[PDB]
């Protein structure tokens, strides 16, 4: 079981009927452990809205992690996506609540259009997890963008994802659940060794003020199943509607206009039944796993806008930080991927020590690594840039 789970099992969560309405603000779903305890005193029927959440809060470590992700869309107008790398911790506002801390957003190979997004295969996918594991990190979810300008004088964006439309398209529900399937969460009471997923979906769109806001979703554990056996399709005309194919028979329970229980063929399936709302947070005490440079090293895969990771930008970057503490200079997830996977002087052989120095924020350890032979020749290479 995950480190957070071994801990939440060992912690009291009180202060079974009126529980849902005391530890307020208004919570939409019970936390996974509490709904577990609210019961101690899944393959291919029907679709009911899920009363529990595997993750209760998504928290970006600081505004900069999210800001820099968004520059891709600002500079291009193209939708962009990334993977959330980080860790799972306790959400102390909610008893037994699970928090997803986002330390870094990794931007993999993709094709972004104004109205479309394609997820190419990442030849570095595996090695990036390997680097991320050694930095105390794992994928906690994915984030994608859906920003369209509205007022080009104000600099604002359409509030297109709202109560009268959708929050998640059916296409993104199927994608979300797929991701949840490939990132299962580990628990005993499930006939496989795993129940659910802790993989979250972040959405950058216009909010009601036509500024950018960040919203968090997971998809129901039922929804997980229908896509796992490919029983769920999206709809061409309307983003708010799924569709069940024909293989088993499912449907949902609405309520009509004199207020009684109902049941109708999922033809279509209103996305609202599949969606699990997670709250989204920027903390007042910000967190700096990675360092914030005034002039950061470039984010990866930014060909299409003329930001490139190469030994010219590293020469530049390194020369702007001669007076900076070396650990602060090097504590950057995107620098580190480049340092490990570049095709000129890769450092995959002698990384471990440095990545340990970044993960534990150890200065003396990083300083000795700066005296490594492979860093000296890295510096010999940079100094030949003019």
């Amino acid at each position: 079981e995950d480190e957070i789970d071994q801990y939440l099992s060992k912690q009291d969560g009180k202060i079974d009927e009126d529980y849902l309405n005391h530890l307020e603000p208004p919570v939409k779903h019970m936390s996974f452990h509490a709904y577990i305890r609210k019961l101690t005193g899944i393959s291919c029927i029907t679709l009911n809205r899920q009363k529990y959440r595997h993750v209760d809060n998504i928290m970006f470590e600081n505004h900069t992690v999210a800001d820099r992700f968004l520059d891709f869309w600002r500079k291009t107008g193209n939708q962009h996506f990334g993977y959330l790398y980080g860790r799972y911790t306790e959400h102390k506002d909610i008893p037994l609540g699970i928090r997803a801390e986002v330390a870094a957003i990794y931007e993999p190979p993709q094709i972004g259009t104004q109205n479309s997004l394609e997820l190419l295969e990442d030849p570095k996918a595996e090695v990036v997890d390997e680097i991320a594991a050694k930095l105390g990190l794992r994928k906690v979810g994915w984030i994608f963008t859906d920003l369209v300008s509205e007022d080009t004088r104000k600099g604002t964006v359409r509030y297109s994802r709202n109560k009268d439309t959708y929050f998640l398209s059916s296409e993104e529900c199927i994608t979300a659940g797929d991701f949840q399937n490939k990132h299962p969460n580990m628990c005993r009471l499930s006939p496989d060794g795993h129940f659910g997923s802790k993989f979250v979906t972040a959405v950058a769109t216009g909010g009601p003020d036509n500024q950018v806001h960040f919203e968090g979703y997971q998809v129901s554990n039922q929804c997980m199943a229908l896509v796992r056996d490919e029983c769920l399709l999206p709809c061409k005309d309307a983003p708010e509607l799924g569709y069940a194919k024909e293989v088993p028979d499912v449907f949902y329970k609405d309520v009509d206009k004199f207020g009684n229980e109902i049941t109708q063929l999922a033809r279509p399936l209103p996305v609202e039944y599949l969606i699990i709302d997670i709250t989204t947070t920027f903390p007042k005490d910000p967190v700096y796993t990675f360092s914030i440079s005034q002039n950061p090293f470039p984010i990866e895969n930014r060909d299409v806008l003329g930001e490139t990771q190469d030994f010219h930008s590293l020469a530049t970057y390194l020369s702007q930080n001669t007076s900076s503490v070396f650990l602060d200079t090097i504590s950057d997830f995107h620098l580190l991927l480049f340092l490990v996977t570049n095709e000129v002087m890769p450092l995959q052989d002698s990384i471990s020590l440095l990545l340990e120095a970044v993960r534990t924020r150890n200065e003396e350890l990083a300083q000795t690594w700066k005296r490594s032979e492979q860093w000296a020749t890295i510096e010999q290479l940079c100094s030949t840039v003019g």
């Binding site: 939708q79 109205n115 479309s116 997004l117 394609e118 997820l119 190419l120 994608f144 859906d146 369209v148 398209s169 296409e171 993104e172 199927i174 994608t175 797929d178 399709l233 999206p234 709809c235 061409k236 005309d237 309307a238 983003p239 509607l241 569709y243 279509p268």
Partner: peptide, 16 residues
């Protein structure tokens, strides 16, 4: 209403 339009790995943002 109409459905078929899907291959995984590719999201489309329906505008109108």
């Amino acid at each position: 209403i109409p459905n078929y339009e899907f291959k995984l790995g590719k999201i489309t943002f329906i505008r109108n």
